[PDB]
Design a protein around this ligand. Structure first.
Ligand SMILES: CC(C)(O)c1cn(-c2ccc(-c3cccc(S(C)(=O)=O)c3)cc2)c(C(C)(C)c2ccccc2Cl)n1
Ligand SMILES: CC(C)(O)c1cn(-c2ccc(-c3cccc(S(C)(=O)=O)c3)cc2)c(C(C)(C)c2ccccc2Cl)n1
Lengths: 232, 236
């Protein structure tokens, strides 16, 4: 059974996830409308990424223990995980019946909509493959929030000054996930390792993204200062 | 809490295959270019000999990796194209895992084959990069603190071979299916090895995560090359 201390920690994760998502709903009319059609779509996805960076920063701040790390390590952790949390979050917002992704909470996008924005098949295909594989695991809101916390507290990230402290903070989240999964599916048991293995997939996805970041140097419109920095 | 007969025989099979692979490679010990000793410490010929020797040790590793894989239950069940795709993508991760297994924390030296022993500086003196030499040593030190045995390494290697997400895999569903008995067997083995820990298993599995980043950084593209970011600092 789950420990009361573990439940508290999870309750805080789910509340922060719900608060940050809700905070971004009001941005729906503020984003450039979906239809040069290609450029407008590219600028639309760009604005959506900017908002996602905000939610991630805002959520991480609410993760128990994140605020006790040094300021330099906090930023270093957030720099390397932003792409991976965006991917994790994309998967949570993926519907396999319609085969579509819900951004904000009304805005629906299909595989072809990303292709029509000038994004390469080299990157869009793995995104949808990852979303489908995540869907089969049947994660709930708590399981994603836990997985995102584990991802944030990665000690091997570049420019991390106190990796021992980062690693020690990841421990309760892995523990809570182990406990949470054992109660939800007592007869599976392979489900928990299958979740952790998705963190391995995320490493490759981030690496594929860094190679696809090259294709963006070709189009005349440059990425906003924020996005251009986090990704290159 | 005891291993199943299917688990015990597989682990034995895996450790047996791991042994005969290393065994066969020791025959090549006098065949490879000798490690230069007594030369001028600034010698070009010596640095080129050191380099050609490490190149040869890597060539032996590859053949050993292929021989071991062919003996992993289910690997030969896959199509030849997936077998190649899986081995192309995992070779470097297996080399690194195998290096950590051969690392000694008392001497701080790595044993290639079973006689040759090299320190951090020995890799530097062969002109190997050091962007990559330091990460090799720190991965080896991290793996030592997990205190893995030969069974746990063979199991982690099998789990690594069967990754559905590798480039050019045509049947990822089957690859992912074949990974499961090795994940199961590792869970049971760690459960019996350290019944009070329970975190040792997820920590082990987590080393595949950092291992995936180590591999990407070794083969990173010149067009994809990557202080505090000012804009992200402003958002806090
Ligand atoms: C290169 C370019 C145009 O600037 C760009 C931006 N994005 C993008 C990145 C992240 C997101 C996103 C992820 C999670 C949630 C949200 S949201 C709108 O707060 O619900 C948006 C949306 C789009 C993306 C794509 C679509 C490729 C992407 C989607 C999912 C995850 C990562 C990336 Cl890079 N490309
Ligand atoms: C490209 C270059 C310069 O020829 C090269 C080769 N290697 C290398 C690769 C693999 C190995 C190796 C790993 C495990 C076992 C063995 S063995 C069969 O016991 O000699 C060799 C040794 C050296 C390496 C280094 C030393 C950097 C390396 C070490 C460990 C893992 C990978 C690599 Cl690339 N660089």
């Amino acid at each position: 059974q789950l420990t009361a201390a573990q439940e508290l920690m999870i309750q805080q994760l789910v509340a922060a996830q719900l608060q940050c998502n809700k905070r971004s709903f009001s941005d729906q009319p503020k984003v450039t409308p979906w239809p040069d059609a290609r450029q407008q779509r590219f600028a639309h996805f760009t604005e959506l990424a900017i908002i996602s960076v905000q939610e991630i920063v805002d959520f991480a701040k609410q993760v128990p223990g994140f605020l006790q790390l040094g300021r330099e390590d906090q930023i270093a952790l957030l720099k390397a995980s932003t792409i991976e949390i965006m991917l994790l979050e994309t998967a949570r917002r993926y519907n396999h019946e319609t085969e579509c992704i819900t951004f904000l909470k009304d805005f629906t996008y299909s595989k072809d909509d990303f292709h029509r924005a000038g994004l390469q098949v080299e990157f869009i295909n793995p995104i949808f493959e990852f979303s489908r594989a995540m869907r089969r695991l049947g994660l709930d809101d708590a399981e994603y929030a836990l997985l995102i916390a584990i991802n944030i507290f990665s000690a091997d990230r570049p420019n991390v000054q106190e990796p021992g402290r980062v690693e020690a903070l990841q421990q309760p989240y892995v523990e809570a996930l182990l406990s949470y999964t054992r109660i939800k599916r007592p007869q599976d048991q392979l489900r928990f390792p299958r979740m952790l293995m998705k963190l391995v997939s995320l490493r490759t996805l981030s690496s594929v993204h860094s190679e696809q970041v090259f294709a963006l140097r070709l189009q005349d419109k440059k990425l906003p200062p924020l996005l251009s920095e986090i990704w290159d």
